[PDB]
């Protein structure tokens, strides 16, 4: 009938009320001051507030406030001021606590959705989620948490229904408690599954284009690949893409091969062309394959691993693209130590610098011819420096994904500490709604009910341990 009455649940030795009270005061004030510190840091910094991906932290901090103040005020409303609690204020406090927990769960939900978008769909993260979509989503999350918190005040209490009534908390019924615990539990299960799937899929997909998956040296790999195609050892060139006119300049490559066919150095060259598309270009490539004995054309669909090996074996990769927005082929080539010879247009203009690879103008077979000749000239010397520089640059463009994975790991840590802190309490609520309700379980509930405040204590501690940008903003504040 009274909120936060320790003597109701367990008999406490009268020698340590002062110690319990002062510990509760220190913990509550520490939580409140550190949460306001987190809000001040996250709001006074332009860099963090302009990033939607960190928004959840603020939301969590707000939730960390909502469960904290309602704690300490309820200590003031009972101990130092001996006023009793009516039905309305008790339901208000219970709604505040439940709103804090539901807001934490929903913030983790929006954070998981954002993590999936940012990690596994990187080409859409910039343009799907922005300021208005994220702020609207967080607003609806907070409002739905608020309304499920407020539902018992509208007439879903134990008094009005006159039904079977809960024992662990008065003035509420079993049906509302079951509904709230069910939606929270199914949400948390979905979060666990989603974060496990995100961390599993991104583990193999991100670290896939590394040279650690290839066995043997580059020279013997190239020799084995060329012997598989029935060709002699030489400087190898690779093209992989789409057989069409306008998107990828494969016709430019074929014209360049025809131009080099008139020279004496063509017999040293080896050419591999992989693609599928217009039958005219396919027939043209087949005619060049039948004419010269150092040109191989592959049309059937290739697996990912096979193409990984091909990048690992060839010496140069030709990308004569007319319009290449993202330059993914260059990134995959340089991740596996292949020098790219690409047209200076689109992303290929700024992925490849003048030192890493060779850049030509778009649509000129002559410039491509001179570039291939210069590549063969450079192949006389050692190309290990080019390989290492291309690998370094390609790994440099992948730095965003690793930070996204680190943020996902921080979110997983937040979720698991939430689960650890709210496990026994949720299980005790399950035991209350389903089955009997004895005094020992009441004492266990009273003991583990401090884990919510401990959870609110430890949530902003790990932000400093994980978020470097939050530390930078805090240092800039001082």
């Amino acid at each position, epitope marked *: 009938e009274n909120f936060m009455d320790i003597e109701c649940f367990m008999v406490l030795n009268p020698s340590q009320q002062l110690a319990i009270a002062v510990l509760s005061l220190t913990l509550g004030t520490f939580t409140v001051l550190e949460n306001l510190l987190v809000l001040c840091v996250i709001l006074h910094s332009r860099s963090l507030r302009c990033r939607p991906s960190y928004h959840f932290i603020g939301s969590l901090a707000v939730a960390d406030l909502l469960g904290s103040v309602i704690f300490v005020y309820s200590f003031i409303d009972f101990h130092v001021f001996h006023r009793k609690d009516s039905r309305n204020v008790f339901l208000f406090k219970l709604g505040g606590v439940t709103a804090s927990f539901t807001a934490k769960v929903g913030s983790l939900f929006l954070a998981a959705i954002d993590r999936y978008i940012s990690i596994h769909r990187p*080409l*859409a993260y910039k343009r799907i989620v922005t300021r208005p979509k994220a702020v609207v989503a967080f607003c609806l999350m907070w409002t739905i948490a608020i309304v499920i918190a407020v539902l018992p005040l509208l007439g879903w209490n134990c008094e009005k229904l006159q039904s079977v009534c809960s024992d662990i908390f008065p003035h509420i019924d079993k049906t509302y408690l079951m509904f709230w615990i069910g939606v929270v539990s199914v949400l948390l299960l979905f979060i666990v599954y989603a974060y496990m799937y995100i961390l599993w899929k991104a583990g193999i997909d991100c670290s896939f284009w590394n040279e650690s998956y290839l066995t043997g040296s580059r020279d013997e790999r190239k020799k084995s690949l060329l012997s598989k195609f029935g060709m002699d050892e030489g400087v190898t060139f690779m093209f992989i893409g789409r057989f069409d006119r306008g998107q990828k300049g494969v016709d430019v490559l074929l014209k360049a091969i025809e131009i080099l066919s008139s020279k004496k150095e063509f017999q040293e060259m080896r050419f591999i062309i992989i693609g599928k598309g217009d039958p005219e270009l396919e027939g043209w490539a087949r005619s060049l394959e039948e004419k010269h004995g150092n040109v191989k054309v592959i049309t059937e669909m290739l697996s990912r691993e096979f193409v990984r090996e091909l990048y690992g074996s060839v010496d140069f990769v030709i990308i004569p693209s007319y319009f290449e927005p993202f330059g993914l082929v260059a990134l995959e080539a340089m991740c596996l130590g292949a020098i790219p010879i690409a047209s200076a247009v*689109g992303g290929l203009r700024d992925i490849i610098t003048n030192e890493t690879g060779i850049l030509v103008k778009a649509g000129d077979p002559g410039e491509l011819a001179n570039a291939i000749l210069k590549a063969l000239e450079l192949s006389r010397s050692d190309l290990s420096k080019f390989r290492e520089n291309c690998k370094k640059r390609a790994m440099s463009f992948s730095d965003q994904a690793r930070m996204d994975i680190e943020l996902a790991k921080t979110l997983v840590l937040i979720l698991v500490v939430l689960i650890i802190c709210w496990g026994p309490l949720l299980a005790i609520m399950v035991y209350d709604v389903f089955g009997k309700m004895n005094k020992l379980i009441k004492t266990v509930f009273a003991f583990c009910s401090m884990l919510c405040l401990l959870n609110s204590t430890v949530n902003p501690i790990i932000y400093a341990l994980r978020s470097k940008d939050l530390r930078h903003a805090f240092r800039s504040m001082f």
Partner: nanobody
Amino acid sequence: VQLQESGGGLVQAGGSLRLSCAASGTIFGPDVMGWYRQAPGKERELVAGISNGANTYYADSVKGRFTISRDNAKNTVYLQMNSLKPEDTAVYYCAAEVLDYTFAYLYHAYWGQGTQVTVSS
């Protein structure tokens, strides 16, 4: 995904014209938008292309005359041409490419219905 065109019709030489292509997908819909044109007795060719922002590409015969833009409020692509030439009479299609990040060779191309545009001197 579903692709719809609008804005087709005849126009006099030296005029102006707009086409709008709308896409309906599940996640971000298309990744790369483009316009292709096909003259009678002539294979289809890429008039213009866009991914996002100022990362555009125009065919060498229409540079400085055509322009292309993208809108995220309705996830559409807008093609503007000014000072029409009488060799621009063709059927126009909007092409949507969804390409996978993990392995660049895989891609999905979707073609719309297309509209007939005739330029009269």
